[PDB]
Design an enzyme around this catalytic site. Structure first.
Site, PDB file in Angstrom:
ATOM      1  N   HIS A  98      49.073  21.543  16.563  1.00 38.56           N
ATOM      2  CA  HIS A  98      47.987  22.500  16.702  1.00 38.56           C
ATOM      3  C   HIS A  98      46.845  21.800  17.425  1.00 38.56           C
ATOM      4  O   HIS A  98      47.049  21.344  18.556  1.00 38.56           O
ATOM      5  CB  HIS A  98      47.604  23.065  15.341  1.00 38.56           C
ATOM      6  CG  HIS A  98      48.699  23.879  14.743  1.00 38.56           C
ATOM      7  ND1 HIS A  98      49.319  24.897  15.437  1.00 38.56           N
ATOM      8  CD2 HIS A  98      49.340  23.791  13.556  1.00 38.56           C
ATOM      9  CE1 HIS A  98      50.269  25.426  14.690  1.00 38.56           C
ATOM     10  NE2 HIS A  98      50.305  24.771  13.545  1.00 38.56           N
ATOM     11  N   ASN A 151      43.153  22.578  11.068  1.00 34.40           N
ATOM     12  CA  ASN A 151      43.244  23.399  12.254  1.00 34.40           C
ATOM     13  C   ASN A 151      42.937  22.599  13.505  1.00 34.40           C
ATOM     14  O   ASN A 151      43.708  22.616  14.461  1.00 34.40           O
ATOM     15  CB  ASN A 151      42.288  24.587  12.121  1.00 34.40           C
ATOM     16  CG  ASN A 151      42.387  25.527  13.282  1.00 34.40           C
ATOM     17  OD1 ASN A 151      41.696  25.356  14.291  1.00 34.40           O
ATOM     18  ND2 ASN A 151      43.256  26.519  13.167  1.00 34.40           N
ATOM     19  N   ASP A 252      37.258  30.415  18.814  1.00 36.09           N
ATOM     20  CA  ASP A 252      38.382  29.573  18.422  1.00 36.09           C
ATOM     21  C   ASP A 252      38.092  28.102  18.709  1.00 36.09           C
ATOM     22  O   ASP A 252      37.250  27.508  18.039  1.00 36.09           O
ATOM     23  CB  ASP A 252      39.669  30.021  19.115  1.00 36.09           C
ATOM     24  CG  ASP A 252      40.897  29.765  18.259  1.00 36.09           C
ATOM     25  OD1 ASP A 252      41.903  30.499  18.385  1.00 36.09           O
ATOM     26  OD2 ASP A 252      40.840  28.817  17.437  1.00 36.09           O
TER      27      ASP A 252
HETATM   28 CA   LIG Z   1      43.880  28.402  16.588  1.00 37.61          CA
END
Ligand SMILES: [Ca+2]
Ligand SMILES: [Ca+2]
Ligand SMILES: [Cl-]
Ligand SMILES: [Cl-]
Ligand SMILES: [Cl-]
Length: 338
Positions: A98, A151, A252
């Site tokens: 990620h 994340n 984001d």
């Molecule tokens: Ca993302």
């Protein structure tokens, strides 16, 4: 209900994209299964995290593996290559990348930190980049109780970083319940070999995170609050709140331009389209540039925006020598003249 109201506020369900065009944008050949995060070194090499999978997010090729790709942005029409991972301390079959971050040592060793979510568990993998051989040498797997659901990270040394957690819970059933109820229990951790602390909490899905070129400020994207939090970063690595910026879009991942300090932000304008995929109604793309973020009125420009007929699900954007590279959660990547 008060809940259906804050749900359609959080996922920004009434949102449509007024186009903002660029005349020379080209899809990067080879990127069809995500390019969710990326980072460009000062010499123009760009690392791209690709192939990552999330429980519940769309995937056009479910058997596809996660890959770190390399792109030399100094080339005229740059091409991607898959970087080889070498070493014996890492299970590659479950590699599911990620967010990423780089750190460059005083010897000019390049380290790549890669958020890994193999299965439900969550790690940070640190690699040494070997440019000549075009490979990633695995060094360490990092696991911690304060890293339940990482994340993105931003590195501050070879195994030193701030990490966002986009959920408080690890189990994917409670995770979706957490996200649906809007508990806002996600938080931000500072990790170092000798010291691991929570530095901020109460986030409604903390996603991108980055740092100012001089180290003095940290930026944290709160996806479902549509907010970018600015923190003062202290010599003892703690953070104190400074500014909160608000937007009409789900923010984001966050790139920082080294020369200006500007923020470049990949955005999901409509959260429904990015979370509940539908081929007849695909998610769009939006890139924000944010200037002078400490001053009274910060300058926010929409540099690129589109309803998905070309690029679906922009999550990261960075600029290099006049060019703009846009990545997506699970789709393609767009290379653009600015
Ligand atoms: Ca993302
Ligand atoms: Ca990142
Ligand atoms: Cl959209
Ligand atoms: Cl400023
Ligand atoms: Cl459009």
């Amino acid at each position: 209900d008060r809940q259906k109201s804050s749900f359609q506020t959080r996922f920004n369900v009434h949102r449509e994209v007024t186009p903002v065009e660029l005349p020379n944008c080209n899809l990067v050949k080879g990127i069809d299964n995500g390019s969710e995060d990326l980072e460009i070194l000062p010499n123009g090499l760009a690392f791209i995290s690709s192939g990552g999978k999330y429980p519940g997010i769309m995937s056009f090729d479910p058997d596809k593996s996660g890959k770190i790709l390399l792109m030399d942005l100094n080339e005229k029409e740059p091409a991607v290559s898959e970087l080889e991972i070498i070493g014996n301390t890492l299970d590659i079959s479950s590699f599911n990348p990620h967010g990423i971050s780089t750190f460059i040592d005083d010897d000019n060793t390049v380290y790549l930190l890669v958020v890994n979510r193999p299965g439900s568990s969550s790690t940070v993998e640190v690699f040494k980049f070997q440019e000549e051989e075009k490979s990633l040498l695995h060094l360490k797997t990092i696991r911690h109780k304060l890293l339940p659901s990482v994340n993105d990270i931003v590195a501050v040394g070879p195994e030193h970083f701030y990490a966002t957690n986009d959920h408080y819970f690890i189990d994917p059933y409670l995770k979706s319940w957490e996200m649906h109820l809007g508990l806002a229990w996600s938080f931000v951790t500072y990790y170092s070999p000798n010291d691991v602390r929570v530095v901020a909490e109460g986030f409604d899905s903390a996603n991108g995170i980055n740092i100012s070129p001089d180290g003095k400020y940290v930026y944290i994207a709160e996806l479902l609050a549509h907010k970018i939090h600015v923190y003062e970063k202290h010599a003892n690595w703690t953070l104190t709140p400074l500014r909160v910026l608000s937007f009409d879009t789900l923010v984001d991942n966050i790139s920082v331009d080294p020369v200006t300090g500007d923020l470049w932000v990949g955005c999901h304008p409509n959260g429904m389209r990015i979370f509940f995929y539908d081929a007849e109604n695909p998610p769009g793309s939006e890139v924000l540039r944010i200037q002078d973020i400490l001053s009274e009125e910060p300058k926010v420009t929409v540099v690129y925006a589109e309803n998905g007929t070309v690029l679906q699900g922009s999550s990261v954007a960075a600029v290099y020598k006049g060019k703009l590279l846009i990545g997506t959660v699970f789709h393609k990547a767009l290379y653009c003249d600015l």
